[PDB]
């Protein structure tokens, strides 16, 4: 026989309960603007999946943000632009303003609003204690606010969150990846960037949830308090896995392949040893010290479990003691 089934601990059903074309996205009409409404400034970034530009929407003279996809399949282009409709507005999320394509080559491009500088890969390697808490309780309202609404982003990473330091603001952005969650859905596990993939993809277990993208939020925690980027080093997919078992040890996760009767790729038969699993201690130092707490390290830990059904949840994070010195701070400000 073959994997135990899985259900997400919470929002298991809020699809379910929506109307149909909130998460069939493949019936979504997008009607496709002009692309010459747009004058491209200067080219900010690249990826797999698009461009990015700065742009000026030459109409009313704003500043926005045009990402021309690469090819992919019709029905990816239309999920993502569902998904961004269905968060728009939402805290901390990346706000569409327009899907166009150059009339030329006819290639699509959404359109977002401007915000205003750094990707967080730059900076969250010399950030306050204080700083690491506040940003990362902005993320976190992003995660419970799309996970409530039924959406993985299932690609969280430094990258992927675009920090105004200026106005203390922070946008989660591309979610190409992103999907709606739907109970017993097995899911392709060729997702997330590397060093941030949950044990889940690593040993191809397809009935995930929204827990990965607390596993991927684990990993940027731990980079930052402990500056070391990327704090799982891995060569390839296996030796993923072989990183994350020096430290969380072998024991909890050969408990988590019996838990879910995974059939481990024989690959893995030599190269995952056996070994302790280790006490955060063994990552502080002298320079890190002073990102270091218990509190830091209690959430951290409660982060990065093999068993995607032992993370906390975003709402779980959210009430952790790391965080009541910034929920204090803010009910102040109001
Ligand atoms: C890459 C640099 C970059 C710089 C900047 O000042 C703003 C940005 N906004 C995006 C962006 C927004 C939504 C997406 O879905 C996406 F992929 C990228 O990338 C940006």
Same mark, same amino acid.
């Given at each position: 026989?073959?994997?135990?089934?899985?259900?997400?601990? !919470?929002?298991?059903?809020?699809?379910?309960?929506?109307?149909?074309?909130?998460?069939?996205?493949?019936?979504?009409?997008?009607?496709?603007?002009?692309?010459?409404?747009?004058?491209?400034?200067?080219?900010?970034?690249?990826?797999?999946?698009?461009? /990015?530009?700065?742009?000026?929407?030459?109409?009313?003279?704003?500043?926005?943000? /045009?990402?021309?996809?690469?090819?992919? $399949?019709?029905? $990816?282009?239309?999920?993502?632009? $569902?998904?961004?409709?269905?968060?728009?507005?939402?805290?901390?999320?990346?706000?569409?303003?327009?899907?166009?394509?150059?009339? /030329? *080559?006819?290639?699509?491009?959404?359109?977002?609003?401007?915000?205003?500088?750094?990707?967080? $890969?730059?900076?969250? %390697?010399?950030?306050?204690?204080?700083?690491?808490?506040?940003?990362?309780?902005?993320?976190?309202?992003?995660?419970?606010?799309?996970?409530?609404?039924?959406?993985?982003?299932?690609?969280?990473?430094?990258?992927?969150?675009?920090?105004?330091?200026?106005?203390?603001?922070?946008?989660?952005?591309?979610?190409?990846?992103?999907?709606?969650?739907?109970?017993? %859905?097995?899911?392709? !596990?060729?997702?997330? *960037?590397?060093?941030?993939?949950?044990?889940?993809?690593? !040993?191809? &277990?397809?009935?995930?949830?929204?827990?990965?993208?607390?596993?991927?939020?684990?990993?940027?925690?731990?980079?930052?308090? #402990?500056?070391?980027?990327?704090?799982?080093?891995?060569?390839?997919?296996?030796? @993923?896995?072989?990183?994350?078992?020096?430290?969380?040890?072998?024991?909890?996760?050969?408990?988590?392949?019996?838990?879910?009767?995974? =059939?481990?790729?024989?690959? #893995?038969?030599?190269?995952?040893?056996? +070994?302790?699993?280790?006490?955060?201690?063994?990552?502080?130092?002298?320079?890190? %010290?002073?990102? /270091?707490?218990?509190?830091?390290?209690?959430?951290?830990?409660?982060?990065?479990? &093999?068993? +995607?059904? *032992?993370?906390?949840?975003?709402?779980?994070?959210? =009430?952790?003691?790391?965080?009541?010195?910034?929920?204090?701070? @803010?009910?102040?400000?109001?």
């Amino acid at each position: 026989s073959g994997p135990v089934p899985s259900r997400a601990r !919470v929002y298991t059903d809020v699809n379910t309960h929506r109307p149909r074309e909130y998460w069939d996205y493949e019936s979504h009409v997008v009607e496709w603007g002009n692309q010459d409404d747009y004058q491209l400034v200067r080219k900010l970034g690249r990826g797999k999946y698009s461009e /990015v530009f700065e742009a000026i929407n030459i109409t009313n003279n704003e500043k926005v943000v /045009v990402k021309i996809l690469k090819p992919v $399949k019709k029905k $990816k282009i239309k999920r993502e632009i $569902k998904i961004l409709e269905n968060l728009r507005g939402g805290p901390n999320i990346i706000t569409l303003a327009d899907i166009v394509k150059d009339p /030329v *080559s006819r290639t699509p491009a959404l359109v977002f609003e401007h915000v205003n500088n750094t990707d967080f $890969k730059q900076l969250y %390697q010399t950030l306050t204690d204080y700083d690491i808490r506040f940003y990362m309780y902005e993320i976190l309202k992003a995660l419970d606010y799309c996970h409530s609404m039924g959406i993985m982003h299932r690609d969280v990473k430094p990258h992927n969150v675009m920090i105004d330091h200026e106005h203390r603001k922070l946008r989660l952005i591309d979610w190409g990846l992103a999907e709606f969650y739907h109970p017993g %859905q097995e899911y392709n !596990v060729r997702v997330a *960037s590397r060093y941030f993939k949950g044990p889940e993809l690593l !040993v191809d &277990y397809q009935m995930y949830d929204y827990s990965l993208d607390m596993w991927s939020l684990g990993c940027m925690l731990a980079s930052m308090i #402990f500056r070391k980027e990327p704090f799982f080093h891995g060569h390839d997919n296996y030796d @993923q896995l072989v990183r994350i078992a020096k430290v969380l040890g072998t024991e909890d996760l050969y408990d988590y392949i019996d838990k879910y009767n995974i =059939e481990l790729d024989p690959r #893995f038969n030599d190269i995952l040893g056996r +070994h302790s699993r280790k006490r955060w201690e063994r990552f502080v130092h002298s320079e890190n %010290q002073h990102l /270091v707490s218990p509190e830091a390290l209690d959430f951290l830990d409660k982060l990065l479990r &093999y068993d +995607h059904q *032992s993370r906390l949840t975003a709402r779980e994070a959210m =009430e952790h003691p790391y965080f009541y010195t910034v929920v204090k701070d @803010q009910a102040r400000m109001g």
